[PDB]
Amino acid sequence: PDIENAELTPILPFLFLGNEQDAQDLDTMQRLNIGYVINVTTHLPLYHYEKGLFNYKRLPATDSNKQNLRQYFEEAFEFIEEAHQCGKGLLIHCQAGVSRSATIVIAYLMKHTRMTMTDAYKFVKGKRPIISPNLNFMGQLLEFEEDLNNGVTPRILTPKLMGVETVVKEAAALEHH
Ligand SMILES: [Cl-]
DSSP states (O other): OTTOSOOOEEEETTEEEEOTTTTTOHHHHHHTTEEEEEEOOSSSOOTTTTTTOSEEEEOOOOOOSSOOOHHHHHHHHHHHHHHHHTTOEEEEEOSSSSSHHHHHHHHHHHHTSOOOHHHHHHHHHHHOTTOOOOHHHHHHHHHHHHHHHHTSSOOOOOTTSOOHHHHHHHHHHHHHO
């Protein structure tokens, strides 16, 4: 509880990070032009699925110290890019939007923005303070960051994304860290 009943966080113009609440808030979603959802849990339902409005993708993971989240990065990344590729907004969430969801977004910012693991972590954190991936996930993000830098993973730096202004705010924010 406490500060945990936070508001849906906008990471990028087309990328939002939230909790199981925001996952249910059909009004905000349609308002924000959400067309895609990623549910990073195994037990929560794909809210509003029946309504046949958005496209979904579940990354069946728990916030355990044993969970493998890497296995899902690539997949989650495409789905995020698909939503991007076509003017739709994407909402990613888990339970509290505190550990699992965040790890995915941080990883994302890493792969598509040669941003450091710490910069990405700080960036997302800046916009959503409650953020706190678990040490298991932190290590995976560390490995991932190493993998990116050594090239064993195709870092996609295609301008296919962000417009100038977006990149500027991004850059300006990292300057604050
Ligand atoms: Cl969580």
